RNA sequence: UUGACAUUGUGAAGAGACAUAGAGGGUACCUUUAUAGUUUC
RNA sequence: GUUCUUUGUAAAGUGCCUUCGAAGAGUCGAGUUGUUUGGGAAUGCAGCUCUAAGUGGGUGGUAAAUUCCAUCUAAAGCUAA
RNA sequence: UUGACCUCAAAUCAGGUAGGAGUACCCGCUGAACUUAAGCAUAUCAAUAAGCGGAGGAAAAGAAACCAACCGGGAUUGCCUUAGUAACGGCGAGUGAAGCGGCAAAAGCUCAAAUUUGAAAUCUGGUACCUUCGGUGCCCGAGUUGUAAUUUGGAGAGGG
């Protein structure tokens, strides 16, 4: 149907998505409650999505009010905009 | 001679603590083809002789150019077998002389004056002609009687 | 559904069934015990470097490579040919272009020369009680990226406009270079 | 030096580089003092090959546009045809 | 030495000197037999780089083979099959001519082991070759452990299995992405991936 | 069965073109000429 | 575990400075024909015609020109599990 | 006349070796059709059966003229996986790999191309002795149209 693509290899296309629904399962349970009982910009829990094995951060559901530092390779428009409502930034790691 | 020479040194080294300097400096021809070509292109040879008949002819054909290039008085002596006997071999295919004793210096430099007269100075016009237009004597006398009648 | 089975060929000749799965495992552990008596004080495997994997999907990890280099062995203070007899793999065709890996391997070789003892060539051969694994003693641990909690700093760069403009510059790089050289050749 | 983001003109993580030792077998093509002498010596013994007779008879006659077109055909590629014709200009220049 | 002055001058195969040596020596090789012994190599530089060492036990044979395609031996052009296979004069014989000329002198000199071979000269009807052979009984070879690997009886008839220099070319054995169908033997990598593998506990 | 390429060389004439080798000659030009050359039928 | 022997004015390894640094041809590659592969403006192998270079050569899965970068070093060889 | 050399021969010459069998696996060449497409010619069956040559306890492959586009891996082999995917095909029937990841096992290397030139330092054979899978002495030969030492690209060499 479309154009032909010679020598395809699915390592140039590895990019698993991660909805903002989950977004806190990457933090373990015993640390999960402590950062929820802190609205502190002084201590935001750093989430490294690439170490967990997630390429892109997509915004699907709504997150709590706590500000979070998120590190990822790719974020979308509504996903990045929803974190700034919580007062958190997105550091583009490569 | 060499087996006699080493037993001479083996007493002279062990007794007189010598550095094998009981033996004098040699003076002899150099004969290996990978060695003579290395003794040319350091301008280190005085004469270089060349056998005319070599069964791979291709082995030797660069020597008159390379002797002309580095300026060494080459010569083409007849016989691969003749050069072998004077170096205690069967065949030798080249022979060259680096050092000569001081008394025999004059007979060498006289000899080079005849050798360069034949070979190193004719080399410019040797390249500009071809050889091999000879014919067998039936075909030779066939074309002469035509050329006589013409 | 349509389903693709590739069985038109004479496949019943070439069928290999692995009933020897529990058989060859028992015949493999008898090799690791026969070798462990022939190599009797020595740890049955050489020491392996630390290597970061290629191919964007997997470059987040770190991995046991093949051998160190000619450079990491020199920086630890020993020659390459003496290194292979001590028990250290040396790979001659690999290169060092990253500093954090280079310091990681030299640190890995410094610790190896303290944990070993090398017997003299002369004799009297003290008892040593070998350890069957060298890769268990010196485990490959992942490096640490960041700390668990940092402070939020924000400058409003919006982080998607950044990825959009980085995208747009690569697409139009050559056309913008073509306009400038057509502009500069005016008169 | 990379930029630190995933896409762009210079994508990838930023690390500190080391520029390792130059390998000997990247200089396989650079010849010698010796084989400059040898190849120039053989060139005057062998002379010229017959297709290279026509190449120097084509540059003197009909420019270098047609000569690259023949030397593409006699040789393999077009990138070899530059180097052979440019060699044949060095022969005519050395003739004068 | 003459290592390079021959090597560089060998490459000028259409200069006025080498096409004289080509036309004289093509005459002499027709007048002899098909297989006959050279007392010494005509190309000492090319033999020496291929493993030759002028000592007792290295034998230089010269061999002459016909030039051209391989006409299929069916009689009167009868083929008896689907019309893809009906061709006769256009089939091309996967082994090179160089590897055929090795197996010819290998069957004749049976006590010898074939080291390698190389081109010398050619004609409209024939190509000429020259095969270097080693004698694994001779005591100059069975010592001096650079060359006593050839005594080992896994190296019986290297030329007939395609293990020589021209054997590994025509099998197409080198590393790379172009050699996928033949990297470790074509019939081994055929039989591997056309094989149903089944375990005790079916995955 | 017919053509091309390879095997396939060497001569003497003939018809050209260039490279060189001087004279003249209205960076050059160009009618001329010699030779020792490389090639086209 | 022992015992008999000095092999060696021998052999090997490491720092710094300067000059060097040789590296495989009827081959690599191109056309064409046959065969072949998943290979698609041509994946290999083979026949024939042409036939390379040295800061070069192959490869970088769309043919071509222009300019770069990356990566190994072909046409010779041995070797357990 | 006499003596070498090069090429080619002859001996029931001295000492050796190859053939043939087996063929389950192995490395090559040559090579079909029935069959599937509801006919059949490209295709498929199949780069298979038969035919022929060659080895071993395994063989073959192997220390990169590699994979890649990354923060790069690092000889070959085999298994799990990539995958019934990219791609090929009267685009129909049908066919169909590779790189990265995890494991089994891990081992590297040497010739050609440097003048030993203040010394062919190398090797077969014979003979005599001997502690005999061999050693030493002697004599014929081989060999400079290049046998040893030195170096193999990761380097390395001549000098200081």
Describe the model.
This is part of a larger assembly, with chains A (94 residues), B (150 residues), C (187 residues), D (96 residues) and E (203 residues). By secondary structure, chain A is an alpha/beta fold. Chain A has helices at residues 29-36, 49-52, 77-86; strands at 17-19, 44-48, 56-58, 69-72, 74-75, 90-92. Chain A is elongated, with a radius of gyration of 16 Å. The termini of chain A are far apart. Chain B is mostly helical and 150 residues long. Chain B has one domain: 60s Ribosomal Protein L30, Chain: A. Chain B has helices spanning 2-16, 33-39, 63-70, 82-85, 105-118, 123-126, 137-149, and strands at 47-51, 74-77, 94-97. Chain B has a 3-stranded mixed β-sheet with strand order 2-1-3, with helices on both faces. In chain B, strand 1 (47-51), helix 3 and strand 2 form a beta-alpha-beta unit. Chain E has helices at residues 2-10, 18-31, 44-48, 97-108, 139-142, 158-161, 167-170, 186-193; strands spanning 35-38, 58-66, 113-122, 126-134, 196-198. Chain A binds chain C through residues 11-12, 14, 31, 41-46, 48, 50-51, 53, 67, 69, 71, 74-77, 80, 84, 87-90, 92, and chain C through 55-58, 60, 145-154, 158-160, 162-163. The structure holds 3 RNA strands.
Characteristic key phrases:
part of a larger assembly, 5 chains, A: 94 residues, alpha/beta, 3-stranded parallel beta sheet, 3 helices, B: 150 residues, mainly alpha, 60s Ribosomal Protein L30, Chain: A, 3 strands, elongated, RNA-binding
């Amino acid at each position: 149907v479309g154009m032909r693509y010679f020598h395809k290899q699915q390592a140039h296309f590895w990019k698993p998505v991660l909805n903002l629904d989950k977004l806190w399962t990457l933090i373990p349970e015993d640390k999960r409650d402590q950062y929820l009982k802190s609205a502190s910009k002084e201590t935001a829990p750093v989430i490294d999505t690439l170490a967990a094995g997630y390429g892109k951060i997509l915004g699907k559901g709504r997150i709590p009010n706590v500000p979070v530092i998120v590190k990822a390779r790719f974020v979308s428009k509504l996903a990045e905009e929803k974190i700034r409502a919580a007062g958190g930034v997105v550091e583009l790691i490569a | 001679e060499k087996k006699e020479r080493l037993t001479k040194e083996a007493a002279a080294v062990a007794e007189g603590k010598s550095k094998q300097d009981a033996s004098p400096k040699p003076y002899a021809v150099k004969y290996g083809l990978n060695h003579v070509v290395a003794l040319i292109e350091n301008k280190k040879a005085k004469l270089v002789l060349i056998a005319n008949d070599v069964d791979p002819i291709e082995l030797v054909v660069f020597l008159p150019a390379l002797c002309k290039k580095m300026g060494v008085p080459y010569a083409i002596v007849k016989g691969k077998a003749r050069l072998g006997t004077l170096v205690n071999q069967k065949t030798s295919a080249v022979a060259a002389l680096t050092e000569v004793r001081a008394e025999d210096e004059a007979a060498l430099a006289k000899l080079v004056s005849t050798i360069d007269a034949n070979f190193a100075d004719k080399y410019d016009e040797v390249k500009k002609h071809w050889g091999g237009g000879i014919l067998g004597n039936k075909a030779q006398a066939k074309m002469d009687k035509r050329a006589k009648n013409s | 559904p349509i389903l693709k089975n590739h069985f038109r060929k004479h496949w019943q000749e070439r069928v290999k069934v692995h009933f020897d799965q529990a058989g060859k495992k028992v015949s493999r552990r008898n090799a690791r015990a026969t070798r462990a008596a022939k190599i009797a004080p020595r740890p049955l495997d050489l020491l392996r470097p630390v290597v970061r994997a290629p191919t964007v999907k997997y470059n987040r990890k770190v991995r046991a490579g093949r051998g160190f280099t000619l450079a990491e062995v020199k920086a630890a203070g020993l020659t390459a040919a003496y290194a292979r007899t001590i028990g250290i793999a040396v790979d001659h065709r690999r290169q060092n272009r990253n500093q954090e890996i280079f310091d990681a391997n030299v640190q890995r070789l410094k610790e190896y020369q303290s944990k070993i003892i090398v017997f003299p060539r002369n004799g009297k051969a003290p008892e040593a009680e070998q350890v069957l694994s060298a890769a268990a003693t010196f485990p490959i641990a992942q490096p640490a990226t960041d700390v668990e909690a940092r402070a939020v700093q924000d400058n409003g760069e919006s982080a998607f406009r950044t990825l959009r403009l980085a995208r747009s510059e690569k697409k139009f790089r050559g056309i913008r270079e073509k306009r400038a050289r057509e502009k500069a050749e005016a008169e | 030096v990379k930029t630190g983001i995933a896409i762009g003109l210079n994508k990838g993580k930023k690390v500190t580089s080391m520029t390792p030792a130059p390998k000997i077998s990247y200089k396989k093509g650079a010849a010698s003092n010796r084989t400059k002498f040898v190849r120039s010596l053989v060139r005057e013994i062998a002379g010229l090959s017959p297709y290279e007779r026509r190449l120097i008879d084509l540059i003197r006659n009909s420019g270098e546009k047609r000569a690259r077109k023949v030397a593409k055909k006699r040789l393999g590629s077009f990138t070899r045809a530059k180097a052979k014709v440019e060699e044949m200009n060095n022969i005519i220049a050395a003739s004068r | 030495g003459a290592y390079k002055y021959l090597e560089e001058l060998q490459r000028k195969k259409q200069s006025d000197v080498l096409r004289f040596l080509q036309r004289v020596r093509v005459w002499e090789y027709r007048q002899k037999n098909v297989i006959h012994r050279a007392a010494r190599p005509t190309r000492p530089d090319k033999a020496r780089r291929l493993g030759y060492k002028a000592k007792q036990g290295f034998v230089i044979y010269r061999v002459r083979v016909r030039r051209g395609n391989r006409k299929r031996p069916v009689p009167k052009g009868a083929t008896y099959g689907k019309p893809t296979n009906q061709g006769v004069n256009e089939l091309k014989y996967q082994r090179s001519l160089r590897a055929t000329a090795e197996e010819r002198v290998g069957r004749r000199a049976a006590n010898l082991r074939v080291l390698n071979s190389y081109w010398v000269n050619q004609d409209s009807t024939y190509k000429y070759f020259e095969v270097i052979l080693v004698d694994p009984q001779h005591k100059a070879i069975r010592r001096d452990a650079r060359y006593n690997w050839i005594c080992d009886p896994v190296h019986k008839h290297r030329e007939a299995r395609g293990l020589t220099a021209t054997g590994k070319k025509s099998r197409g054995i080198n590393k790379g992405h172009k050699f996928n169908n033949t990297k470790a033997g074509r019939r081994k990598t055929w039989k591997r991936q056309n094989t149903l593998s089944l375990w005790r506990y079916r995955k």
